[PDB]
Amino acid sequence: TNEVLETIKARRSVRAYDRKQIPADDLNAILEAGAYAPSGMHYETWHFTAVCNTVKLEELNERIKGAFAKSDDKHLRERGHSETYCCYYHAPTLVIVSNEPKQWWAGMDCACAIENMFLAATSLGIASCWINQLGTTCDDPEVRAYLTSLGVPENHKVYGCVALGYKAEGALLKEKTVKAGTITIVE
Amino acid sequence: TNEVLETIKARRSVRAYDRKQIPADDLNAILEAGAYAPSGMHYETWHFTAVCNTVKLEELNERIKGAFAKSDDKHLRERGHSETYCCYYHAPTLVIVSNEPKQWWAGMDCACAIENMFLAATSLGIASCWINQLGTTCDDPEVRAYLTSLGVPENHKVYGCVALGYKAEGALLKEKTVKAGTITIVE
Numbered sequence: 001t002n003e004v005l006e007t008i009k010a011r012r013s014v015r016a017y018d019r020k021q022i023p024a025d026d027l028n029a030i031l032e033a034g035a036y037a038p039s040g041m042h043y044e045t046w047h048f049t050a051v052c053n054t055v056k057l058e059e060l061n062e063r064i065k066g067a068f069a070k071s072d073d074k075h076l077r078e079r080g081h082s083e084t085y086c087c088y089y090h091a092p093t094l095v096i097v098s099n100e101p102k103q104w105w106a107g108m109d110c111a112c113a114i115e116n117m118f119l120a121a122t123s124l125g126i127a128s129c130w131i132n133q134l135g136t137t138c139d140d141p142e143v144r145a146y147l148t149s150l151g152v153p154e155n156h157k158v159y160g161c162v163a164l165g166y167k168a169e170g171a172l173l174k175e176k177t178v179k180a181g182t183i184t185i186v187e
Numbered sequence: 188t189n190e191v192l193e194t195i196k197a198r199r200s201v202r203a204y205d206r207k208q209i210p211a212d213d214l215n216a217i218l219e220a221g222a223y224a225p226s227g228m229h230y231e232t233w234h235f236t237a238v239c240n241t242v243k244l245e246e247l248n249e250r251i252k253g254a255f256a257k258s259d260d261k262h263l264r265e266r267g268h269s270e271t272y273c274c275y276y277h278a279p280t281l282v283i284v285s286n287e288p289k290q291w292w293a294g295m296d297c298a299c300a301i302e303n304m305f306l307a308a309t310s311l312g313i314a315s316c317w318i319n320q321l322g323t324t325c326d327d328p329e330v331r332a333y334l335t336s337l338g339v340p341e342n343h344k345v346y347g348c349v350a351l352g353y354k355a356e357g358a359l360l361k362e363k364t365v366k367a368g369t370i371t372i373v374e
């Protein structure tokens with residue numbers, strides 16, 4: 001083992017957050033870690049829009065709910081008509097990770113960046129979670145108008161988001177185990 | 188800074204490899220790191236097929252060339268008719284990372300796993316590179332027959348591969364810099 005290997009195993013998806021905002025230096029380190037992810041052809045066409053403002057996060061969540069309210073999926077209409085659903089779990093920071101959809105691997109660039117950010121965050125004692133609700137909603141007219149106002153490029157799609165914060169006091173995680181049999185070694 | 192942050196910045200794509208195979212314990216640590224990646228809904232539907240046999244790697248590369256020889260893309264026909272092209276750069280190990288294509292985020296699961304593996308490898312002094320040539324070729328009949336024989340599930344597509352090895356003696360990398368302006372912070 002080593003610190004990297006242990007941080008990789010220790011990374012978890014956290015869905016309950018303290019109100020305290022993370023420090024600017026930590027946010028910069030986490031975003032830089034995403035920036036250093038591999039990208040196809042070294043295109044670096046991604047954008048990372050770190051939203052740290054509680055009012056704007058709440059407004060964006062309302063727009064996402066509004067998009068869901070338009071859906072036929074029962075689970076999605078239920079979110080859309082909820083008075084409590086918050087896709088980012090009241091994390092104080094959400095990083096919207098977007099890319100142009102030109103290359104077929106566009107989302108994999110983003111996932112690499114996102115995984116770096118999770119690991120960077122874990123190494124700094126900062127909880128994180130993948131927030132996926134902008135993938136299918138980013139082209140809803142009201143959601144898109146909101147994203148544009150935040151600085152997400154209009155020609156980008158949103159491939160994933162990163163919630164960041166401190167784990168809520170007394171929030172306990174399920175013990176992690178992984179599926180045996182995902183690995184084949186051919187000698 | 189910390190070891191995780193530094194390992195993240197230090198990770199590079201390496202395309203020249205020594206002949207020495209990596210140690211079994213390192214390979215297991217790297218694969219475990221992939222296994223601990225986040226996956227949508229915790230489905231863990233991915234498979235990791237670590238191919239450590241030079242003969243089989245060469246045969247697989249021939250099949251990939253054969254698929255490319257069928258293409259119209261000039262760059263791909265050139266690879267297909269090459270006597271020297273090797274998509275995995277003669278790395279002693281290639282990990283084929285596959286998933287069922289049921290969910291739209293299938294490839295992002297794989298990219299998360301792959302990024303963990305890169306970082307795990309870097310932390311152990313093991314060079315790595317994303318090898319993308321099975322994404323568009325995995326359903327070619329001869330390539331697919333080969334993948335099946337290696338143990339890649341027949342219902343999976345290949346979203347990315349990881350070359351692993353030691354960097355060739357005297358192989359020098361271009362200094363890494365990242366694009367300024369990919370980050371927007373909204374306070």
Ligand SMILES: Cc1cc2nc3c(=O)[nH]c(=O)nc-3n(C[C@H](O)[C@H](O)[C@H](O)COP(=O)(O)O)c2cc1C
Pocket residue numbers: 011012013014015129130131132133176223224225226227228229292295296299
């Ligand atoms: C592509 C993808 C999308 C995900 N989307 C969400 C999501 O929108 N909301 C959420 O709470 N967790 C999301 N997750 C987190 C997974 O549920 C989590 O990784 C899985 O349950 C394993 O738990 P762990 O991260 O603690 O290892 C997503 C993960 C992946 C990789």
Ligand SMILES: Cc1cc2nc3c(=O)[nH]c(=O)nc-3n(C[C@H](O)[C@H](O)[C@H](O)COP(=O)(O)O)c2cc1C
Pocket residue numbers: 036037038039040041042105108109112198199200201202316317318319320363
């Ligand atoms: C989705 C994706 C696909 C890639 N495919 C290949 C490839 O097939 N062959 C290769 O040599 N490098 C591949 N790369 C590596 C990129 O070229 C590399 O990440 C980029 O040039 C930045 O260099 P660095 O990894 O040293 O930071 C791929 C990277 C990404 C994320």
